[PDB]
Structure formats: structure tokens, C-alpha cells
Amino acid sequence: GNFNVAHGLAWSYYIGYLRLILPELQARIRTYNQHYNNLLRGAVSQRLYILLPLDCGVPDNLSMADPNIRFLDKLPQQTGDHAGIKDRVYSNSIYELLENGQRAGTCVLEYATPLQTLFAMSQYSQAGFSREDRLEQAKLFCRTLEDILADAPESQNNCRLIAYQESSFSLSQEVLRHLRQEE
């Protein structure tokens, strides 16, 4: 039930996206740092940071969710032909993480989009899913994605999952704690 739906979305997230952008992600980051970002303490991290809100609350604007998260730039976009669609675009955004009025981190940050589907299926009666099912599917989505990335050859320490519950919550502080943990 709740397993098979989140199992398919996690594999969909990996087949259709992560396995395609992760092998060439660190080269895109290194190219951006060497040519467009000569800040000795402001280099873009070498990992794609995927936000996993366990309540599946995914806003369309990541910066307006926290005044300490500021859009900086975009990586060089990656294109390719997929399913008869010529030059399908894959673009990732670089963000500035502020703390105490200072630049504390720079990272490629985005949400796990399939969590929006779990929310919609919990919202629409035709999908026939309840809110408690959505919470269980979100946890099963994260766990399945962990099992895939732990065995995927495209994941060469270039992607970090950030799962969290749910305002006394700072999203930039959530990413900064994971950022500084690897530095």
C-alpha cells in the first residue's frame, strides 16, 4: 500500500533525475568555482543537497521560506533528449546561506519534488490516500532513496539527503549543520 507508492516514486526520482545529473554534477560545480566564484571562503560545495521535509510541505520558492537563504546563481545547465522531447533541460540553483549577517555556506539546494505528489495524493479524493498514509509514504520514500543511493554508482559522495520534521525552525540552520559536518 503505502510502501509500493513511495517505492515507485523513489525509483522514479533516481531513474529520471539523480542517475542522470549526479555523474556530471561535480564537474559542473568545479567549473563554476574555478571560473565564476573565486571566493576563498565562498566556494560552492561539491554535493547536491536534497531537502526532505517529512510532512511533504514543499514550497515553490525555497528562498522565501527563510530570509537567510538567498539565491545566488545557477550551475551550467545540462540538456539531453528524453522520450521524444528534444533538449530536455536540467538546471540546478546555487544558494547563499546566511548566519549572524555573515556568509556561512554556499550550496546547490533543492527539494525532493516527488514529495509534492505525496501531498497532492493526500489532498485529492480520487487518489484515495489519507494524511497518515502520506506521512508513512514520506518516510518510506526517504528510506528507499537512501537504499538506492547507497548502492548507486552515480553517487560518489556528491549528494546528501536532509530529512526533517515540519516558526522556531530555520531551514538555513538545518543545511548549515549538515554542511559544517563534512568540512
Annotated binding site for 3',3'-c-di-GMP: 12, 17, 88-91, 113
Burial 38-47 (b: 16+ CB within 10 A, else e): eeeeebbbbb
- Cα 153 to Cα 8, 22, 35, 141, distances in angstroms: 20, 10, 28, 20
Decide if residue 71 touches a second copy (CB under 8 A): yes
- The SS3 assignment for 129 reads coil
| 67 within 8 A of 128, measured Cβ to Cβ | no
Q: Which residue is nearest to ligand PWB (CB)?
A: 16
Decide if residue 34 touches a second copy (CB under 8 A): no
The option from a second copy, ligand PWB, none interacting with 172 (CB < 5 to 8 A, set by class) reads: none
CB of 104 to ligand PWB, least distance (A): 26
Distance of CA 33 to the CA centre of its chain: 20
The option from ligand PWB, a second copy, none interacting with 93 (CB < 5 to 8 A, set by class) reads: a second copy
CB of 96 to ligand PWB, least distance (A): 21
CB of 6 to a second copy, least distance (A): 7
